Design a protein around this nucleic acid. Structure first.
Ligand SMILES: O=C1c2ccc(O)c(O)c2C(=O)N1Cc1ccc(F)c(Cl)c1
Ligand SMILES: O=C1c2ccc(O)c(O)c2C(=O)N1Cc1ccc(F)c(Cl)c1
Ligand SMILES: [Mg+2]
Ligand SMILES: [Mg+2]
Ligand SMILES: [Mg+2]
Ligand SMILES: [Mg+2]
Ligand SMILES: [Zn+2]
Ligand SMILES: [Zn+2]
Lengths: 368, 184, 368, 184
DNA sequence: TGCGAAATTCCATGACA
DNA sequence: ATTGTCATGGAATTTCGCA
DNA sequence: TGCGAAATTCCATGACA
DNA sequence: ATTGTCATGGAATTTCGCA
């Protein structure tokens, strides 16, 4: 306030005010003649109010706020004060977009064996076909082998019915699913404990985490669409055809079909491969074990030039899941409790519970 | 001549009538010849139609070069023959009254009848629900002749449901008392 | 057929069949012992059928189809035949995705003067506020100066009412809009002819083309959302506040506000700039003319490594606009009549009319 | 002392009662002092409320440092004073019975009354629709004193609606005959 | 020990709504 | 308490057939 | 004729649903 | 018959204040 600006008018040096300019009084206000022109130097006790009125005109960020202020005022380290306010504007923090990208994706290891890990998910609603609307898709992690079930709803009860049929063949160690209602119910949890099956869940609102099955949904819809061209969308009777068609399709990067990775030999389908015709089953299973372990595995891609990775103790904000019209896209700031891996964290909610969350659904809070 | 393989030959047969369970009366039994792997499907009748429906499920997972059966009516119909031909599956019949499969298959089918009967008694009406667990049991059962279970031979890995209690399969005195009474 | 495969069995050379392998007969079929194993060589008259059965199993692309065929057969230049079929599978051509990106965006020149070109558009439906649901947004191309009007519908009639008020101030040479119902009606076309105003339309289904106004919609919704935090969404009374707030906000890259680019001097709003206080109006307008011409203009960015640009005579397919569930995402192939610029073309529809279309809504037909 | 600029001073006034047009009876007239640019707003009454509503539109486009008016009741009310104070607009009044604006403004207002009257006759009820075209006319009218139109001075460019027919503004013998009859 | 062509591998693009 | 994926078809690169 | 810090400019990111 | 845009806040770079 007055203390500082006093010493100044009488030509003494204050840290921050460059000596080479001259600082007069006029109209009851301290002033300075700067290269851009004459600016008022407000008392420090007045600065936060000024920064705040400038910011509030349109809730502008750093430069656009500064440019308003600079029209009338000058003082030492203006942006420091502007930034101080930006970091406290609740409305800016929760409405503005991020401008930092997520760090590069992980490529989790292929499950070592068939039945080690199932990914499951629903497709639909589809046009009604024999009273059916959805498809449960079950993809074996290691092999890509896929089972399809038509259902009337994405319910626990229809999940359970379908998996009782599937698990006739074998019981998986793990079932990975997203947080759909069908999979997170306590009835489904009991169904899995009853069987020794561990339930693994995707972080919420992050379908990429079920990428294995999501990607197979693509191929399913794509082949259905082709088979249905110029016919009514009667998909129910094509599920079995599509299932077998896909399980016996080569992946060009692997050079094997999912059927082959599961059984190590083709059944009586068209164009069956015959290379192991002179091997005993035991020799064939032995070649299969070799093939299973040496499959191509992709690596983590390069980070984009402006990505961020989470650090324990960081303020970060969780994306609002289904934000109403004209409502903020971000929750209030929260703290990283634990970095589970560079793409997955535990935060202290906003509710405030522990929440395990994908970094894709987080932004780092701006201005610290 | 080339070694035996999974999907070379499926052996099929019906078991039943059984007491009704959730509407069903029969079990279509399919056993892979090389591995001894078993699949079971509940049906309402031993008809061509019910066989076709059930085999349509199995043959959307894997197709055998040959189906072997007895001369049951469901299997000798011209419909079932058309079905098989459409899928490039050769049909194979034992001669009437002389049912012959293979040692491994015969034994497997015998295991199936005995395991069914054991779990029937006490709850002769609740078998529909148990078919999955039966199958797991059967397919994770050690083969004296080969050093491996059907599961192991089919998929070339250990199973997450080993059945280390290779079991009685025999009826206790109480269970014969239950089954000589149910049949009264 | 037989002609070719005859000469072969008797050790004579046929172009395409390498001499160093030996070609026997067996089971009524010509065969060859290749490094991967023994393959049947079908008669040429049989090959298209084979390629087609392999392809049809799952409607696979080049490699995944080839890998099926190679299980049983070998012949000269298999992929040539596979590709020939892929280029004729209607179902594949119209269902598959593209894997070529659009060429880099154009940055059209800033309109030279205020009122040279308006971009207009609707935002909404928004939560009801005093019976209003939409906002007409009018952005002046040169300046970014923006007018906001609350409406009850995105109708021609409310467009006309709003623009009769706006054009009180000045009449624009051009109004650019997208193809919304409100702007493409014959009533709206008459309204513009009556006034000497040329109507320019975006290519269909390409909001980027109205980027000028779309981008301002973002800022409008963003400031409304901030102003409405923790209050009911009563936006009607804030339109005027938001309008003035944005028209007087600096763009950091330009260093001017839209108000400034339009008038060359600030009105009595907070933090008004005072640099031209000692200039006459005429001097000030003269400085404004200078500032208007020297504004930063962005350039066309680098092409991505696998983009395509349209060539006259090319087969290309138009994106299906609102494709039903399990229906193809692409129309049947069509021909580029005219390359209007590297991002805009005229094609021979599918209906088959002339249609002016963005390259972002096209893929080049695969396999020629 | 510094040169005159747009938004330095807005001169406001009411014209009316007029014959009702789409419900409206008055025109609030605003003229920028430096440029002579005119804005017109139809109102139902010469009230503070109607002035505030109309000026709320204009002042969401541009805010004057000073509003000048006569001592009309709408402009001297404590509400209108509160409104102006909230926006940092200084209010300025001519003395009662002595209305003084500026040469440029006086002439402009005179143009406005005469242009209105000219287009009234024949269609005294259709003025609401014509207010836009009136404004364009006025704002693209050459200034004898300055070498420029209000449009040119406000935006510093030529307009796309030049009004090269700098017009009569005078009533033909037929139109006086129409207006001496309408007033009967 | 090297050439032209074919075969294979690479890999950006885009959809899992 | 968890984590992207992989068919696709031009282009880049390697291998093949022959000398 | 050069240093540390402040000021300015650069520019990838993401939303216009 | 047409065509992306630009606020944002860290980082990179330039300028300032002083010697
Ligand atoms: O948006 C959803 C979604 C929401 C809720 C669900 O239960 C669910 O299964 C899905 C789902 O499949 N997708 C599509 C999608 C979008 C982007 C992606 F990267 C991937 Cl992989 C998938
Ligand atoms: O999807 C639409 C759309 C459809 C129809 C309209 O009339 C319309 O105004 C819009 C619209 O604004 N957006 C949002 C959007 C999406 C992506 C982009 F790049 C840009 Cl710029 C804008
Ligand atoms: Mg899901
Ligand atoms: Mg999904
Ligand atoms: Mg629109
Ligand atoms: Mg839009
Ligand atoms: Zn703010
Ligand atoms: Zn196809």
């Amino acid at each position: 306030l007055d203390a500082e600006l006093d010493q100044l008018l009488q030509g003494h040096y204050i840290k921050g005010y460059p000596k080479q300019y001259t600082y007069f009084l006029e109209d009851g206000k301290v002033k300075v003649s700067r290269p851009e022109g004459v600016k008022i130097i407000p008392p420090q006790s007045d600065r936060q109010k000024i920064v705040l009125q400038a910011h509030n005109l349109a809730h502008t960020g750093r430069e656009a706020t500064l440019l308003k202020i600079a029209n009338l005022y000058w003082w030492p380290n203006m942006r420091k004060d502007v930034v101080k306010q930006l970091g406290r504007c609740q409305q800016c923090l929760i409405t503005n977009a991020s401008n930092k990208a997520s760090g590069p994706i992980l490529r989790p290891d292929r499950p070592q064996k068939p039945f080690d890990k199932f990914f499951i998910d629903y497709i639909g609603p589809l046009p009604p076909s024999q009273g059916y609307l959805y498809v449960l898709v079950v993809v074996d992690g290691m092999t890509g082998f896929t089972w399809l079930y038509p259902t009337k709803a994405p319910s626990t009860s229809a999940t359970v019915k379908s998996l009782n049929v599937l698990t006739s063949i074998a019981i998986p160690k793990v079932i990975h699913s997203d947080q759909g209602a069908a999979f997170t119910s306590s009835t489904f949890a009991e169904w899995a404990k009853e069987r020794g099956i561990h339930l693994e869940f995707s972080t919420p609102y992050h379908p990429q985490s079920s990428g294995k099955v999501e990607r197979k949904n693509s191929d399913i819809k794509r082949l259905l669409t082709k088979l249905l061209v110029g016919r009514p969308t009667k998909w129910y009777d094509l599920l079995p055809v599509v299932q077998l068609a896909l399980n016996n399709t080569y992946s060009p990067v692997l050079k094997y079909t999912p059927h082959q990775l599961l059984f190590g030999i083709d059944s009586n389908t068209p164009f069956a491969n015959q290379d192991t015709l002179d091997l005993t089953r035991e020799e064939e299973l032995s070649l299969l074990q070799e093939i299973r372990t040496s499959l191509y595995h992709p690596s983590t891609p390069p980070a984009s030039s402006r990505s961020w990775s989470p650090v324990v103790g960081q303020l970060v904000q969780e994306r609002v899941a289904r934000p109403a019209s004209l409502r903020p896209r971000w929750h209030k700031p929260s703290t990283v409790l634990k970095v589970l891996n560079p793409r997955t964290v535990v935060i202290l909610d906003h509710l405030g519970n522990n929440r395990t969350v994908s970094i894709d659904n987080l932004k780092p809070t701006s201005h610290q | 001549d080339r070694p035996q393989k999974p999907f070379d030959k499926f052996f099929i047969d019906y078991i039943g009538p059984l007491p009704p369970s959730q509407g069903y009366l029969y079990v279509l039994v399919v056993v892979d010849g090389m591995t001894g792997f078993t699949w079971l499907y509940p049906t309402k009748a031993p008809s061509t139609s019910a066989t076709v429906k059930s085999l349509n499920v199995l043959t959307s997972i894997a197709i055998p070069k040959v189906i072997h059966s007895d001369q049951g009516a469901a299997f000798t119909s011209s419909t079932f023959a058309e079905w098989a031909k459409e899928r490039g599956i050769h049909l194979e019949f034992s001669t009437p009254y002389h049912p012959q499969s293979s040692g491994k298959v015969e034994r497997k089918n015998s295991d199936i009848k005995r395991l069914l009967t054991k779990l029937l008694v006490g709850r002769p009406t609740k078998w529909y629900d148990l078919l999955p667990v039966v199958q797991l049991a059967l397919n994770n059962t050690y083969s004296p002749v080969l050093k491996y279970t059907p599961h192991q031979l089919l998929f070339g890995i250990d199973s997450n449901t080993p059945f280390a209690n290779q079991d009685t399969l025999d009826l206790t005195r109480e269970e014969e008392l239950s089954l000589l009474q149910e049949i009264r």
